[PDB]
Amino acid sequence: RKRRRVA
Amino acid sequence: GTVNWSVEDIVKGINSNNLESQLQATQAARKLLSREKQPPIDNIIRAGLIPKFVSFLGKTDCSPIQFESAWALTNIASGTSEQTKAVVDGGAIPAFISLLASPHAHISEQAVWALGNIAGDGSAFRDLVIKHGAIDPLLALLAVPDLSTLACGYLRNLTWTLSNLCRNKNPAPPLDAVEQILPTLVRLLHHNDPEVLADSCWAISYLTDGPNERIEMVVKKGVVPQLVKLLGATELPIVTPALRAIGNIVTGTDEQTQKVIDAGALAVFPSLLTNPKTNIQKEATWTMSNITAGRQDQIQQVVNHGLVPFLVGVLSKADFKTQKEAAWAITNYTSGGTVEQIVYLVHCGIIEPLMNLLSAKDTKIIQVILDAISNIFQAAEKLGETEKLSIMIEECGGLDKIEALRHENESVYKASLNLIEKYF
Ligand code: NA
Numbered sequence: 001r002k003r004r005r006v007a
Numbered sequence: 008g009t010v011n012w013s014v015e016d017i018v019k020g021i022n023s024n025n026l027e028s029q030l031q032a033t034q035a036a037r038k039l040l041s042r043e044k045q046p047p048i049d050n051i052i053r054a055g056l057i058p059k060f061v062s063f064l065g066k067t068d069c070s071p072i073q074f075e076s077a078w079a080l081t082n083i084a085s086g087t088s089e090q091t092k093a094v095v096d097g098g099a100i101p102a103f104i105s106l107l108a109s110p111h112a113h114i115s116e117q118a119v120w121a122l123g124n125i126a127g128d129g130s131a132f133r134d135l136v137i138k139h140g141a142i143d144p145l146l147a148l149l150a151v152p153d154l155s156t157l158a159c160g161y162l163r164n165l166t167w168t169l170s171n172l173c174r175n176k177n178p179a180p181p182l183d184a185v186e187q188i189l190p191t192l193v194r195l196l197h198h199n200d201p202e203v204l205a206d207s208c209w210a211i212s213y214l215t216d217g218p219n220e221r222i223e224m225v226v227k228k229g230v231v232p233q234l235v236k237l238l239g240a241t242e243l244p245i246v247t248p249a250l251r252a253i254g255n256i257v258t259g260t261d262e263q264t265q266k267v268i269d270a271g272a273l274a275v276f277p278s279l280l281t282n283p284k285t286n287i288q289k290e291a292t293w294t295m296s297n298i299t300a301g302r303q304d305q306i307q308q309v310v311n312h313g314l315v316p317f318l319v320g321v322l323s324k325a326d327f328k329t330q331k332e333a334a335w336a337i338t339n340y341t342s343g344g345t346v347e348q349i350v351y352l353v354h355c356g357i358i359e360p361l362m363n364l365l366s367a368k369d370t371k372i373i374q375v376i377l378d379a380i381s382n383i384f385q386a387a388e389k390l391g392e393t394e395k396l397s398i399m400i401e402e403c404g405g406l407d408k409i410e411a412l413r414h415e416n417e418s419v420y421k422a423s424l425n426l427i428e429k430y431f
Contacts, residue, residue: 001127001165002084002085002086002091002123002127002128002226002281003085003108003120003123003124003126003169004040004041004046004081004082004085004086005041005081005082005085005117005347006041006042006043007041
C-alpha cells in the first residue's frame, strides 16, 4: 500500500 | 499563483538560481501531483526534477522548499514500483531520514509518509529503508509518556509507516528491526484512535504471517489479549486485521493457539461466524479450522463455547468459500476428536448440511466431506451405531449423493465406494 497526499 | 502551471514552467523555475523561484515551481509541482485525477507523475519524472527535489530536502534554511519537495517526492513514490524506484534512485532515502529530525512537525510528518511509500513498494526497498537507519528516528518521534499529546494525523502516518516496515515476505522483515519496533507497536495497539488501532493490528497481522518463531516474538510481547479485545470492536476496519493476526497465531503451535483460547477468543466467534461481512465469516471459519486441528482439550473448549452449532450453520448457509473452510474445520475436528465429541457434532445436526455440500462441483470439498463421513462412521463403529448413522444419512439423501460419487477424481469415487460398501 502507498498513499498520495491530495488537496 | 502556483495553480495549473506547465511542466516546462516548473522546470524553468527549478532551473533558476533563485531558491524563492525554485520554491514556487516546487509548490506548483506538488499542486499538480496532489490533484484528484491523473497526477502527471511520469511527466515530472521525464522532466528530470527528482534530483532537484532531493537536493531541496537538504535546504534547512528554506523549510518551505523541504516540505514542498517532500510532498512532491511522496506523491511520485505513491505510484508504480517504477515511480517509487525513481525516487529511491535520486538519493531520497537518506535525505528523508535526516528530515525525520526536522524541528518542523509538518516536514517531519511528510518524511514519514515518504518513507512509508518507499517501504510499501516491497521487501527490498523496505529493507533498504531499514539499512539506511530509519527505525531509530521513527521510534524517537513516539518516545513520549502519552501518545495522546501527539497530533492525530502525525501518529496515524507514523503508525502506517511502521506497519509498512513490518509488511511483505520473501524476505520477511529483519528480526532485529521487528524486535526494535514491536515494543512501540504494542503501545499503539493500546491507543484510543481507531485508524492507529487498525494499522497497528495490520502490522501484527504481517508479523504473525510466518514461521512459528515470528508468532512467538509477538505472543511473548503479550498482545493476544488486546487483539482479542479488538476482535470485539464495532469497527470492521479494526476487526478485519485483529482476526487475521489471531488467525495467523493459531497456525503455530498448540501452545500458541492455547494463548488465544486463554485470552478468551472463542467467546467472540459466535458473532464472527454470524458476521454480515463474508470475509470476516470466512476468515473466522478458517481460524476455527486451525483450532479444531489442535489438541482434544482445545476441541473441548470449542464445544464449551457453543461454536459447533455455529459451524453447523456456516455449513448450512454461507459463501461456498466459508462453507469450504467449515468442511475443513469439521474434518480436522472429526480427525483429532474423541468419539464423545464426534457424536456431539452429529447431535448438533452436521449430517444434513455436510451431505448437501457433496452435490457441489469442487472435488477438494467432496474429498474433505467424505474424509469427515468416514471419521464419524469409525466413531460409530466404536459405539455400535453405524446402522443408525447409515439410516440418518439415507434419509437426508446422502447415500444417493455418495452413490453418484462416477467422478473424474479417483480418491473421490474410491472413498465413496469404500463407504458405500463398508457402511451402506
Ligand atoms: Na450416531
